Design goal:
The structure is a monomer. It contains 8 helices and 9 strands. The chain is of the alpha+beta class and 263 residues long. It has one domain: DD-peptidase/beta-lactamase superfamily (Beta-lactamase), CATH 3.40.710. The longest helix is centred in the first third of the chain and has 13 residues. It is classed as hydrolase.
Length: 263
Amino acid sequence: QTSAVQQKLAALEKSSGGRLGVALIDTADNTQVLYRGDERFPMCSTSKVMAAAAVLKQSETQKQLLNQPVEIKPADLVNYNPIAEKHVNGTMTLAELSAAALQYSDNTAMNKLIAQLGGPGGVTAFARAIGDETFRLDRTEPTLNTAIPGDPRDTTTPRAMAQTLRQLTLGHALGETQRAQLVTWLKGNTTGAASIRAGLPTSWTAGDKTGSGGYGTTNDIAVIWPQGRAPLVLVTYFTQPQQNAESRRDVLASAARIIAEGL
């Protein structure tokens, strides 16, 4: 039977007209709260966390990798390059590319991270290595954001992503220095003020990575540190029936608000 929490999420879903996916992990007792937790959703930019994490994993055995300068050619620019455009015919280190990809959702930066890993398959390979058997990255930017209904490309489930995000930020899928670096990047995100963060108590600290794409796909995954209690991991994926549907970050904030009550 559904709980009052799942009932509220379903009501929110019905009201929005789309399909909502939610996964909450409370590390206090390791219990999970899920809504369509095992259904696949287009990740869009939330996949950038896996790519950045994969590069962090590589740097565990190559201490200076993050500081390795990477050339940015005019032709490398894609559809959204807020940071990469400032370095055309110049360079960006993998750490700078990671920060740009995670904190500003720079798409060129993501393509450089994917390239560093040997292609989309390299990102998926990292996922499998850390126990994520669901995640799959098939394309590069910007086509990985098409978010076509039913298409399994570039998707994952809320449960899988929440489990993986916990392993990466609170668990030990990454080495000590690397885990901390990921947390630092997620906490400094500049794109999530209207998503999960908007629905959490203002006293709570959080790190997040948003995502958006076709079909009004609006996503956000976050790691949360409530005041006076063990941390949480929350994933909120949302997609709609029609290709040009508008963004609905408010739905994600609403889902977070629902999830936060009674904790």
